[PDB]
Amino acid sequence: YTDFENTFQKTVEPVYQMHIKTSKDIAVLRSKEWFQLDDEDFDLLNKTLTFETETEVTFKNANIFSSVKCF
Amino acid sequence: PVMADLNGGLQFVPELKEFTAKLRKELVETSEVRKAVSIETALEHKVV
Amino acid sequence: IPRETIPFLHLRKKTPAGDWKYDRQLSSLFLDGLEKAAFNGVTFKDKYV
């Protein structure tokens, strides 16, 4: 089968945990556009964050995705 | 005896040690953040 | 303590310039303690020296 326009994949990702220990970790997270706090002035230092993501993918071919959603 | 102050006004900077430790952190923090953010931006670009 | 007289015993305070100068308030604390010591005595109970 080579009909990649009809394919799609939804994955429930494993829950990822980050312990934010330093202000470097905070800066590295704020550098990511996808990281979107409700309150931008939220204090991340010494906090444990959990990311509960789902990935929706559509294929162009076997190896390359035509679209990626992670939310 | 002669006492020559060749100190370049340094004595008039109050709380000098703290002032030097703050300039050091402001520099090391900026260095380490830029290193980490550039390494992650390269790895993101690599993945995509 | 007269105005513009430095007591024979006094405390000094470090100025923002980093010089140690007579301080009337600290000196008043020290001298009042000495006066109380001289009338009432002072205890050192539970000091390890």
Side-chain angles (χ1 to χ4, degrees):
Chain A
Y1 302 96
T2 66
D3 69 321
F4 288 100
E5 69 269 26
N6 298 317
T7 65
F8 61 86
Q9 181 171 2
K10 177 182 260 287
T11 310
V12 175
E13 293 294 339
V15 179
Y16 292 100
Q17 198 176 57
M18 285 175 86
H19 301 83
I20 313 308
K21 291 272 167 275
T22 74
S23 70
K24 185 215 290 190
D25 301 343
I26 296 180
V28 171
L29 278 170
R30 288 215 153 88
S31 67
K32 302 310 196 173
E33 184 194 341
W34 54 252
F35 186 89
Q36 296 189 12
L37 295 171
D38 293 311
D39 181 276
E40 253 284 27
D41 300 297
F42 189 91
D43 184 28
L44 292 171
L45 193 44
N46 303 306
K47 297 316 210 318
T48 301
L49 294 192
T50 46
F51 302 81
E52 304 179 334
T53 60
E54 300 177 327
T55 315
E56 292 168 354
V57 131
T58 70
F59 301 76
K60 209 197 86 213
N61 71 45
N63 306 302
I64 296 100
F65 309 113
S66 80
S67 171
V68 184
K69 281 158 199 50
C70 199
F71 59 104
Chain B
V2 167
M3 187 180 282
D5 181 307
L6 313 178
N7 192 25
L10 189 73
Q11 65 275 14
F12 295 100
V13 179
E15 249 312 329
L16 176 52
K17 167 168 167 84
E18 284 180 11
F19 183 58
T20 69
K22 153 165 282 186
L23 291 172
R24 205 187 306 262
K25 285 329 89 197
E26 279 176 348
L27 221 67
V28 161
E29 192 191 344
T30 300
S31 172
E32 273 197 336
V33 155
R34 271 182 212 190
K35 191 164 305 199
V37 167
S38 80
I39 275 181
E40 290 301 333
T41 299
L43 282 187
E44 172 142 334
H45 178 97
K46 166 66 208 124
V47 157
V48 171
Chain C
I1 299 169
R3 187 177 284 92
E4 301 234 56
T5 293
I6 303 194
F8 285 142
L9 313 176
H10 67 267
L11 303 199
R12 296 197 188 142
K13 180 175 191 256
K14 197 194 179 50
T15 62
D19 321 318
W20 288 85
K21 298 292 246 299
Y22 166 59
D23 190 80
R24 197 189 173 87
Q25 293 73 26
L26 292 187
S27 302
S28 302
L29 197 64
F30 176 62
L31 288 165
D32 296 341
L34 289 187
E35 183 181 39
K36 282 165 55 227
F39 279 117
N40 297 333
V42 46
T43 196
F44 302 122
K45 154 180 177 65
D46 300 338
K47 201 163 284 289
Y48 293 75
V49 185

Short mmCIF file of all heavy atoms in Angstrom, two decimals, chain A residues 3 5 7 9 14-15 17 19 23 27-31 34-35 39 42 44-45 51 62-63 65-66 71:
data_model
loop_
_atom_site.label_atom_id
_atom_site.label_comp_id
_atom_site.label_asym_id
_atom_site.label_seq_id
_atom_site.Cartn_x
_atom_site.Cartn_y
_atom_site.Cartn_z
N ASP A 3 -0.76 4.52 -0.60
CA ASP A 3 -1.82 5.55 -0.60
C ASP A 3 -1.68 6.34 0.71
O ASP A 3 -2.59 6.28 1.57
CB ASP A 3 -3.21 4.90 -0.79
CG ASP A 3 -3.69 4.04 0.38
OD1 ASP A 3 -2.85 3.31 0.98
OD2 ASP A 3 -4.90 4.13 0.72
N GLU A 5 -1.89 9.41 1.51
CA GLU A 5 -2.87 10.51 1.73
C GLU A 5 -4.05 10.02 2.59
O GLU A 5 -4.80 10.87 3.11
CB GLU A 5 -3.36 11.09 0.40
CG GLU A 5 -4.25 10.17 -0.43
CD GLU A 5 -3.55 9.26 -1.44
OE1 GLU A 5 -2.36 8.93 -1.23
OE2 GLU A 5 -4.21 8.89 -2.45
N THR A 7 -3.64 7.75 5.11
CA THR A 7 -3.07 7.27 6.39
C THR A 7 -3.03 8.41 7.43
O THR A 7 -3.12 9.59 7.07
CB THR A 7 -1.75 6.56 6.14
OG1 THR A 7 -0.78 7.47 5.63
CG2 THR A 7 -1.91 5.42 5.15
N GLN A 9 -2.10 8.69 12.12
CA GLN A 9 -1.74 7.99 13.36
C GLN A 9 -1.93 8.95 14.51
O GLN A 9 -1.43 10.08 14.42
CB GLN A 9 -0.34 7.43 13.23
CG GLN A 9 0.10 6.66 14.46
CD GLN A 9 1.40 5.96 14.20
OE1 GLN A 9 1.99 6.07 13.13
NE2 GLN A 9 1.86 5.21 15.18
N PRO A 14 3.61 8.60 26.36
CA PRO A 14 3.83 8.39 27.78
C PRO A 14 3.93 9.76 28.47
O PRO A 14 4.32 10.71 27.82
CB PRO A 14 5.15 7.62 27.88
CG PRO A 14 5.82 7.77 26.53
CD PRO A 14 4.74 8.17 25.53
N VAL A 15 3.49 9.84 29.73
CA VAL A 15 3.60 11.09 30.54
C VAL A 15 5.09 11.32 30.81
O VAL A 15 5.77 10.37 31.25
CB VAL A 15 2.77 11.02 31.83
CG1 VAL A 15 2.94 12.29 32.66
CG2 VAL A 15 1.30 10.76 31.52
N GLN A 17 7.95 13.76 32.77
CA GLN A 17 8.12 14.58 33.99
C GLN A 17 9.46 15.32 33.89
O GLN A 17 10.48 14.66 33.64
CB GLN A 17 8.11 13.67 35.21
CG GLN A 17 7.86 14.41 36.51
CD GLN A 17 7.78 13.43 37.66
OE1 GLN A 17 8.71 12.67 37.91
NE2 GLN A 17 6.66 13.45 38.37
N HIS A 19 11.71 17.84 36.49
CA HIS A 19 12.06 18.61 37.71
C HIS A 19 12.84 19.86 37.27
O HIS A 19 13.98 19.69 36.84
CB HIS A 19 12.86 17.73 38.67
CG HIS A 19 12.13 16.51 39.11
ND1 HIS A 19 12.08 15.36 38.35
CD2 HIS A 19 11.42 16.25 40.23
CE1 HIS A 19 11.37 14.44 38.97
NE2 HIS A 19 10.95 14.96 40.14
N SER A 23 17.49 27.95 36.51
CA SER A 23 16.94 29.00 35.62
C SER A 23 17.33 28.76 34.16
O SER A 23 16.75 29.42 33.27
CB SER A 23 17.40 30.37 36.07
OG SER A 23 18.79 30.54 35.81
N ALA A 27 14.75 28.70 30.89
CA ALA A 27 15.08 29.45 29.65
C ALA A 27 14.95 28.51 28.45
O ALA A 27 14.40 28.95 27.43
CB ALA A 27 16.48 30.02 29.75
N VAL A 28 15.45 27.29 28.58
CA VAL A 28 15.37 26.22 27.53
C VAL A 28 13.90 25.91 27.24
O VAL A 28 13.59 25.70 26.06
CB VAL A 28 16.13 24.95 27.94
CG1 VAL A 28 15.87 23.81 26.98
CG2 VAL A 28 17.63 25.19 28.05
N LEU A 29 13.02 25.88 28.25
CA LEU A 29 11.57 25.64 28.06
C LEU A 29 10.93 26.85 27.39
O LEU A 29 10.12 26.64 26.48
CB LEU A 29 10.88 25.30 29.38
CG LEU A 29 11.00 23.85 29.83
CD1 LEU A 29 10.50 23.69 31.25
CD2 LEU A 29 10.26 22.91 28.88
N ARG A 30 11.25 28.07 27.83
CA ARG A 30 10.67 29.31 27.24
C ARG A 30 11.16 29.50 25.79
O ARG A 30 10.48 30.21 25.04
CB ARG A 30 10.99 30.53 28.10
CG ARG A 30 10.22 30.58 29.42
CD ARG A 30 9.85 31.99 29.83
NE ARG A 30 8.64 32.00 30.66
CZ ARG A 30 8.60 31.86 31.99
NH1 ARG A 30 9.71 31.71 32.70
NH2 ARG A 30 7.43 31.88 32.60
N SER A 31 12.28 28.89 25.41
CA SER A 31 12.80 28.95 24.01
C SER A 31 11.90 28.15 23.05
O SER A 31 11.96 28.42 21.84
CB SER A 31 14.23 28.49 23.96
OG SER A 31 14.35 27.12 24.24
N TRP A 34 6.10 25.83 21.51
CA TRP A 34 5.03 24.86 21.89
C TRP A 34 4.72 24.90 23.39
O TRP A 34 3.56 24.61 23.74
CB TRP A 34 5.40 23.46 21.45
CG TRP A 34 6.72 22.91 21.88
CD1 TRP A 34 7.81 22.71 21.09
CD2 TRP A 34 7.02 22.27 23.13
NE1 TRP A 34 8.78 22.03 21.77
CE2 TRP A 34 8.33 21.78 23.03
CE3 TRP A 34 6.32 22.10 24.32
CZ2 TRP A 34 8.95 21.11 24.09
CZ3 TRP A 34 6.93 21.45 25.37
CH2 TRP A 34 8.23 20.98 25.25
N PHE A 35 5.69 25.28 24.22
CA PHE A 35 5.52 25.44 25.68
C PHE A 35 4.75 26.72 25.99
O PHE A 35 5.33 27.80 25.83
CB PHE A 35 6.89 25.43 26.34
CG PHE A 35 6.81 25.43 27.84
CD1 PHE A 35 6.75 24.23 28.53
CD2 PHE A 35 6.81 26.62 28.55
CE1 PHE A 35 6.70 24.22 29.91
CE2 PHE A 35 6.77 26.61 29.93
CZ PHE A 35 6.71 25.41 30.61
N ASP A 39 -0.53 31.45 32.63
CA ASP A 39 0.07 32.64 33.29
C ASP A 39 1.56 32.67 32.94
O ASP A 39 2.32 31.85 33.50
CB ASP A 39 -0.17 32.58 34.81
CG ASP A 39 0.38 33.77 35.57
OD1 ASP A 39 1.59 33.75 35.90
OD2 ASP A 39 -0.40 34.71 35.84
N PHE A 42 4.24 32.68 35.69
CA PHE A 42 4.25 31.49 36.58
C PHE A 42 5.71 31.18 36.94
O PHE A 42 6.56 31.26 36.04
CB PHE A 42 3.58 30.27 35.93
CG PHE A 42 3.37 29.11 36.86
CD1 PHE A 42 2.19 29.00 37.58
CD2 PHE A 42 4.36 28.16 37.06
CE1 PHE A 42 2.00 27.95 38.48
CE2 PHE A 42 4.17 27.11 37.95
CZ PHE A 42 2.99 27.01 38.66
N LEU A 44 8.42 28.65 37.68
CA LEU A 44 8.71 27.22 37.38
C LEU A 44 9.80 26.68 38.30
O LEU A 44 9.89 25.44 38.40
CB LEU A 44 9.11 27.10 35.91
CG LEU A 44 7.98 27.39 34.92
CD1 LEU A 44 8.52 27.48 33.50
CD2 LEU A 44 6.89 26.33 35.02
N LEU A 45 10.58 27.54 38.95
CA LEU A 45 11.80 27.10 39.70
C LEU A 45 11.38 26.16 40.84
O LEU A 45 10.45 26.52 41.56
CB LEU A 45 12.55 28.33 40.21
CG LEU A 45 13.97 28.10 40.72
CD1 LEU A 45 14.78 27.18 39.80
CD2 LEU A 45 14.68 29.43 40.89
N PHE A 51 3.98 16.47 31.41
CA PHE A 51 3.49 16.72 30.04
C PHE A 51 2.68 15.50 29.61
O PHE A 51 3.27 14.42 29.51
CB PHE A 51 4.69 16.96 29.13
CG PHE A 51 5.56 18.12 29.55
CD1 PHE A 51 6.50 17.97 30.56
CD2 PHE A 51 5.45 19.35 28.92
CE1 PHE A 51 7.31 19.04 30.94
CE2 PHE A 51 6.25 20.41 29.30
CZ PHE A 51 7.18 20.25 30.31
N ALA A 62 6.53 6.86 3.64
CA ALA A 62 6.86 5.91 4.74
C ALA A 62 7.57 6.62 5.90
O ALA A 62 7.20 6.35 7.06
CB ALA A 62 7.69 4.77 4.19
N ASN A 63 8.54 7.50 5.61
CA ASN A 63 9.50 8.07 6.60
C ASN A 63 9.13 9.51 6.98
O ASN A 63 9.29 9.86 8.17
CB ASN A 63 10.93 8.02 6.07
CG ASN A 63 11.33 6.62 5.65
OD1 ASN A 63 11.27 5.69 6.46
ND2 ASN A 63 11.70 6.45 4.39
N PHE A 65 6.57 12.65 7.64
CA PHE A 65 5.21 13.10 8.00
C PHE A 65 4.87 14.31 7.14
O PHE A 65 5.79 15.06 6.82
CB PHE A 65 5.09 13.41 9.49
CG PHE A 65 5.58 12.32 10.41
CD1 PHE A 65 6.71 12.50 11.20
CD2 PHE A 65 4.94 11.09 10.46
CE1 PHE A 65 7.18 11.49 12.03
CE2 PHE A 65 5.40 10.08 11.30
CZ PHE A 65 6.52 10.28 12.07
N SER A 66 3.61 14.44 6.75
CA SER A 66 3.06 15.61 6.02
C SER A 66 2.50 16.61 7.03
O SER A 66 2.19 17.75 6.64
CB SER A 66 1.99 15.19 5.03
OG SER A 66 0.75 14.96 5.67
N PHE A 71 -0.07 18.01 21.30
CA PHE A 71 -0.91 18.89 22.14
C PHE A 71 -1.24 18.13 23.42
O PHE A 71 -1.05 16.91 23.48
CB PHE A 71 -2.17 19.34 21.39
CG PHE A 71 -3.05 18.22 20.92
CD1 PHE A 71 -4.23 17.92 21.59
CD2 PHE A 71 -2.71 17.46 19.81
CE1 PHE A 71 -5.05 16.88 21.16
CE2 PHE A 71 -3.52 16.41 19.38
CZ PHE A 71 -4.69 16.13 20.05
#
